[PDB]
A paper describes a structure:
We mutated the exposed and partially exposed residues (P8, K15, R17, R39, K41, R42, and D50) to alanines because we expected that these substitutions would minimally affect the densely packed interior of the native protein45. The mutants were named according to the numbers of alanines in their sequences (i.e. BPTI-19A stands for a BPTI variant containing 19 Alanines) and a suffix ‘a’ or ‘b’ was added to distinguish variants containing the same numbers of alanines at different sites45. To provide a structural view of this peculiar instance of enthalpy stabilization, we crystallized and solved the structures of six simplified BPTI variants containing 19, 20, 21, 22, 23, and 24 alanines. On the other hand, despite repeated trials, BPTI variants containing 25–27 alanines merely formed needle crystals, unsuitable for diffraction. All six variants crystallized under the same conditions, indicating a minimal disturbance of the surface properties, even upon multiple alanine substitutions. X-ray crystallographic analyses indicated that all of the simplified BPTI structures fully overlapped and that the main change that occurred upon the number of alanines was an increase in the solvent content in the asymmetric units. The new water molecules were recruited around the alanine substitution sites and were involved in novel hydration networks. Thus, favorable protein–water interactions appear to be the most likely factor responsible for the increased unfolding enthalpy of the simplified BPTIs, rather than the relaxation of atomic clashes or the creation of new intramolecular hydrogen bonds or van der Waals contacts, assuming that the hydration structures remain the same for all alanine mutants in their denatured states.
Here, we report a structural and thermodynamic analysis of six extensively simplified BPTI variants, where 19–24 of its 58 residues are alanines, using differential scanning calorimetry (DSC) and X-ray crystallography. We used a stabilized BPTI- (BPTI- A14GA38V12), containing only the 5–55 disulfide bond, as the reference molecule instead of wild-type BPTI, which contains three disulfide bonds13, and a BPTI variant containing 19 alanines (BPTI-19A) as the template for further simplification. However, the alanine substitutions exerted a small unexpected enthalpy stabilization, and the magnitude of which increased in a nearly additive fashion along with the number of alanine substitutions, which was, however, over-compensated with entropy destabilization. A structural analysis indicated that new water molecules were recruited into the spaces created by the alanine substitutions, facilitating protein–water hydrogen-bonded interactions as well as interactions with the methyl group and creating hydration networks around the substitution sites.
Residue numbers in the entry: 1001 to 1057
């Protein structure tokens, strides 16, 4: 899969509490996490569907 999909989710430094999805290769599933609203990495999607389409080849 895309290497970015293997990275840990990144909340980043922002003050917001936004629910986003990362692909968790360990679980083989998309999972919610809290994103702070700034400096997203690529393993960070609006929905489980978007995460699987990008990362679950």
């Amino acid at each position: 899969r895309p290497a970015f999909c293997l990275e840990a989710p990144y909340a980043g430094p922002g003050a917001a509490a936004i629910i986003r999805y990362f692909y968790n290769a360990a679980a083989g599933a998309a999972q919610a996490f809290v994103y702070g609203g700034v400096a997203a990495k690529r393993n960070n999607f609006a929905s489980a569907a978007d995460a699987l389409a990008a990362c679950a080849a």
